[PDB]
Design a protein around this ligand. Structure first.
Ligand SMILES: O[C@H]1CC[C@@H]2CCN(c3ncnc4[nH]ccc34)[C@@H]21
Length: 167
């Protein structure tokens, strides 16, 4: 039993809700919140810009030190950093950005990172400003993640479409 509330159950392990991931994290304080990161951990917009803003830019400061030490992530890769005031940890995961010409096949590799964590609060990878089809992203999530994932979909209209089209 966990403290996530109001989610629709899609499968044995995947749950979904129309919610702002920032406000959800602040309420639940999950062990792991997933960020929709880029390889440079430059948290400018989308989920990443919103999460970083909620940390008063502490996420960005920590991320800049991470990159200075380690260099960029791989597309499909991830790193674990602090969750600041939002969660214990933030799993920064890089899904392919279609608006950069990146291979959508890397989306499965991106979701595989979730399997290293028993429970996560997460967005749909590569959706939104990353340019991929959110219906497809949800399918890859369900077919790849085996740990318990609580998905927050910001757009209410999209949430209804994701639910109504889910197979
Ligand atoms: O699930 C994500 C997949 C792509 C969509 C674009 C934004 N995004 C968000 N989801 C949840 N909370 C959010 N806060 C701020 C943004 C945001 C969606």
């Amino acid at each position: 039993v966990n403290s996530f509330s109001g989610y629709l159950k899609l499968t044995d392990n995947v749950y979904i809700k129309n919610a702002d991931i920032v406000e959800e994290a602040k309420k639940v304080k999950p062990t792991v919140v997933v960020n929709a990161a880029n390889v440079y951990l430059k948290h400018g917009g989308g989920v990443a810009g919103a999460l970083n803003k909620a940390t008063n830019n502490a996420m960005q400061v920590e991320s800049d030190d991470y990159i200075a030490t380690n260099g960029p992530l791989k597309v499909g890769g991830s790193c674990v950093l602090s969750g600041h005031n939002l969660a214990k940890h933030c799993l920064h995961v890089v899904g392919p950005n279609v608006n950069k010409g990146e291979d959508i096949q890397l989306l499965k590799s991106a979701y595989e990172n979730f399997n290293q964590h028993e429970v996560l609060l997460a967005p749909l990878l590569s959706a939104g400003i990353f340019g991929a089809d959110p219906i497809h992203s949800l399918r890859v999530c369900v077919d790849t993640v085996r740990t318990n994932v609580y998905l927050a979909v910001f757009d209410k209209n999209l949430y209804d479409k994701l639910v109504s089209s889910f197979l």
